[PDB]
């Protein structure tokens, strides 16, 4: 009983002491003579329109030409970014949707929402129409994020404080990761697709191994719920998007905080976070209807992406790193370059 | 300058846009109420006369009502309560009958305080359904309201107790400049609740139209 709690306290203090001992210097002081990137001027290129309600999520295709968006209108429009054309317009069953996923192969799409059911739609059929290929069920809470591992697997994170790994064919729940104490609000997949980090509402993030079940590392330091998580292209770091006007950068191989990106002029929460192709920049979406481009190596502002009349809800960067698409509650997506 | 396949793709995109516009205009001509309550309350009966979210479509006097009942959604209300911003009205069902500690009325007013004084719901109106009148009568004749409301000081008649409860439930609204609360007692008389809902929705629609034109 109590002895277990005391042993847990000793384990925690040992962990924090070891982490403190492993700390010798800060990244900010390490990169003190690394020239600034200068002002980053951003201009809208395309202004994809056609939604009739708040946009809640989006995802870029593998070719970095096609994207998919969802809104409370009840639609899953698929846009061709180059010519602002619509390829498909999938009508949903329940309009309370807050998640999208585009398969890396490009054949399927996935959509979650408040109905606790993850629908998987097939795009390429001989009938020339999109039909619901599968309907995964089993979560007892609202779905928050879903990502495609392969054409036959999916990873979901919902509000029942658990994450799931589903096999599409059998429709089962092949793995279930648990250990959080609050709603899980975001999820990101490593480039090698063997590990993934989930950020919960208990002001924490965890690193899960897809093959196994337990969480190898737990990262804390935020003072509020985390609404966004994004990996670093190197695969040895990630960035969070918590609600207390602060985005922090965590490193996998030291279990330690590295840097925080905060300004006394910013008080609103962060909804989306995404790195760049190389990792020099970090784009974050705030509730000020703006988007901030933080110099990820030295924690300085490098530009502003104003132009939206409402909260920025989804943010994405193309695979080739040629453009950045932001979708807001104004029922508008914009393609900056 | 476009090719043939590009022209055909543009044609398909225009057709898709037309279909989207028609679907949106069709879906804008309807009323969307959000149902709420605490405990058992009277949600079952309320949806009777009229695994996550549950919808219910019904037509009255040539008007389409949808009634989103969050119900079985045990989660953080703060995370998804903003999805319902813009609903026409919030129906709030409470039962006067319980008032027996084991305190439920206290929880009901706590939930009402948390819902009414919310940043998102600063414009949407609230319809209040105080139900279980017969059980309230059967209970009042042996026990007074002093157990739940000590401060209370009045006659044990039914009318005074009902008025006091209504006044306290209407006293928790702080922004009494943009939002109005309508109160009913259902009584399960057959066409007594849907008519009240229709009247409240008509008043809300009138106010919204006046605000949109620019003279309200």
């Amino acid at each position: 009983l109590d002895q277990l709690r005391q042993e847990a306290e000793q384990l925690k203090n040992q962990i924090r002491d070891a982490r403190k001992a492993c700390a010798d210097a800060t990244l900010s002081q390490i990169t003190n003579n690394i020239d600034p990137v200068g002002r980053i001027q951003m201009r809208t290129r395309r202004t994809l329109r056609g939604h009739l309600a708040k946009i809640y999520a989006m995802h870029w295709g593998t070719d970095s030409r096609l994207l998919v968006s969802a809104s409370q209108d009840g639609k899953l429009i698929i846009w061709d970014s180059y010519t602002t054309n619509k390829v498909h317009a999938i009508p949903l069953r329940s309009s309370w949707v807050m998640t999208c996923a585009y398969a890396p192969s490009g054949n399927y799409v996935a959509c979650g929402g408040l109905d606790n059911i993850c629908s998987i739609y097939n795009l390429k059929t001989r009938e020339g129409n999109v039909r619901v290929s599968r309907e995964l069920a089993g979560h007892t809470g609202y779905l928050s994020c879903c990502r495609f591992l392969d054409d036959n697997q999916i990873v979901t994170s919902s509000g029942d404080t658990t994450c799931a790994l589903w096999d599409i064919e059998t429709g089962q729940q092949t793995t279930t990761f648990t250990g959080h104490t609050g709603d899980v609000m975001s999820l990101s997949l490593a480039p090698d697709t063997r590990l993934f980090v989930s950020g919960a509402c208990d002001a924490s993030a965890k690193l899960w191994d897809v093959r196994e079940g337990m969480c190898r590392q737990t990262f804390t330091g935020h003072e509020s719920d985390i609404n966004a998580i994004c990996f670093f292209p190197n695969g040895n770091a990630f960035a969070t998007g918590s609600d207390d006007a602060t985005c922090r950068l965590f490193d996998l191989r030291a279990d330690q905080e590295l840097m925080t990106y905060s300004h006394d002029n910013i008080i609103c929460g962060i909804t989306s976070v995404s790195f760049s192709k190389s990792g020099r920049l970090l784009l974050a979406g705030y509730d000020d209807f703006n988007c901030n481009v933080w110099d990820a190596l030295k924690a300085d502002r490098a530009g502003v992406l104003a132009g939206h009349d409402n909260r920025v809800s989804c943010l994405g960067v193309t695979d080739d790193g040629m453009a950045v698409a932001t979708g807001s509650w104004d029922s508008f997506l914009k393609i900056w370059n | 300058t476009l090719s043939a396949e590009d022209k055909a793709a543009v044609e398909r995109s225009k057709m898709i846009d037309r279909n989207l516009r028609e679907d949106g205009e069709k879906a804008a001509r309807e009323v969307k109420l959000l149902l709420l309550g605490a405990g058992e309350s009277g949600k079952s009966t309320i949806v009777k006369q009229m695994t996550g979210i549950v919808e219910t479509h019904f037509t009255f006097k040539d008007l389409h009502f949808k009634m989103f009942d969050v119900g079985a959604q045990r989660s953080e209300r703060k995370k998804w309560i903003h999805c319902f911003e813009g609903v026409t009205a919030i129906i709030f069902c409470v039962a006067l009958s319980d008032y027996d500690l084991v305190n439920r009325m206290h929880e009901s007013m706590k939930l009402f305080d948390s819902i009414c004084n919310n940043k998102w719901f600063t414009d949407t109106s609230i319809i209040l359904f105080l139900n279980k009148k017969d059980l309230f009568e059967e209970k009042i004749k042996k026990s007074p309201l002093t157990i739940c409301y000590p401060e209370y000081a009045g006659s044990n008649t039914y009318e005074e107790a009902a008025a006091y409860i209504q006044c306290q439930f209407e006293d928790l609204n702080k922004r009494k400049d943009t939002k109005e609360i309508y109160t009913h007692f259902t009584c399960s008389t057959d066409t007594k609740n849907v008519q009240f809902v229709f009247d409240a929705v008509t008043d809300v629609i009138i106010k919204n139209n006046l605000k949109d034109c620019g003279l309200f």
Partner: single-chain antibody
Framework: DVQLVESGGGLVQPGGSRKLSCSASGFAFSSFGMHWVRQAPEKGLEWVAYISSGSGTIYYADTVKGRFTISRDDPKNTLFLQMTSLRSEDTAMYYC??????????????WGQGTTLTVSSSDIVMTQATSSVPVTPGESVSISCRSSKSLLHSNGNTYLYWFLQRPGQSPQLLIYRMSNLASGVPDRFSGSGSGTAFTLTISRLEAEDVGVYYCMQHLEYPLTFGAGTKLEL
């Protein structure tokens, strides 16, 4: 179960006004463009008419303006072409081709069965040069379709298609846009080249590949077809 069945064939006197019909079952007919393509008794294919989805774009061939009228009926899932003032040239077998146009789509996917019609009494020329060549199973072959104008639009994609017609059956799509293998086609087939120089290659030959191979352009809409190269033995 994708089926396109045509009807309305039979002998017609000169000056007749017979009408042909096409019934489609097994796909969303409302969102597919439809092509009527004729084939002479022994010559190659020849585009005739095209109707778009939504009936917003109608295109006719060179010889049939004012005499042929195409039309579709979506709820009944039918597509009929009314032919007036018939001559002796129109003695041919008519087909029924579907084509859906969007980014990454494969037009001219499925072909009908064809109905015969007998009547007893500018454009991009695409020469296929060679007409026939004897081959043996287990060999690699190539077919050239030298064109007149370069089929290289500013978008960066070449509009050219390779079809194969087996002896007695209906032509089926093999290659679209000279680089993408059509669905269901085995890996062995391939296509390559540049503007005004296109080659389709087959790695190993065996039965069921003997037939006639055709090439078609799709830049503008007097859609032309190649002469047709015969592979036999």
């Amino acid at each position: 179960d994708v089926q396109l069945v045509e009807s309305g064939g039979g002998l017609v006197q000169p000056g007749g006004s017979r009408k042909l019909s096409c019934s489609a079952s097994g796909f969303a007919f409302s969102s597919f463009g439809m092509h009527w393509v004729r084939q002479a008794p022994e010559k190659g294919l020849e585009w005739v008419a095209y109707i778009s989805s939504g009936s917003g774009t109608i295109y006719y061939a060179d010889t049939v303006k004012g005499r042929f009228t195409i039309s579709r009926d979506d709820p009944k899932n039918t597509l009929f072409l009314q032919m007036t003032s018939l001559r002796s040239e129109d003695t041919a077998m008519y087909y029924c081709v579907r084509s859906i146009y969007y980014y990454g789509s494969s037009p001219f996917d499925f072909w009908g069965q064809g109905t015969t019609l007998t009547v007893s009494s500018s454009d991009i020329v695409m020469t296929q040069a060679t007409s026939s060549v004897p081959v043996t199973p287990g060999e690699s072959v190539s077919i050239s379709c030298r064109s007149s104008k370069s089929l290289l639009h500013s978008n960066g994609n070449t509009y050219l298609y390779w079809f194969l017609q087996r002896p007695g059956q209906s032509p089926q799509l093999l290659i679209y846009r000279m680089s993408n293998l059509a669905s269901g086609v085995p890996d062995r087939f391939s296509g390559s080249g540049s503007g005004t120089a296109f080659t389709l290659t087959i790695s190993r030959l065996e039965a069921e590949d003997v037939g006639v191979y055709y090439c078609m352009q799709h830049l503008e809409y007097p859609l032309t077809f190649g002469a047709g190269t015969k592979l036999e033995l």
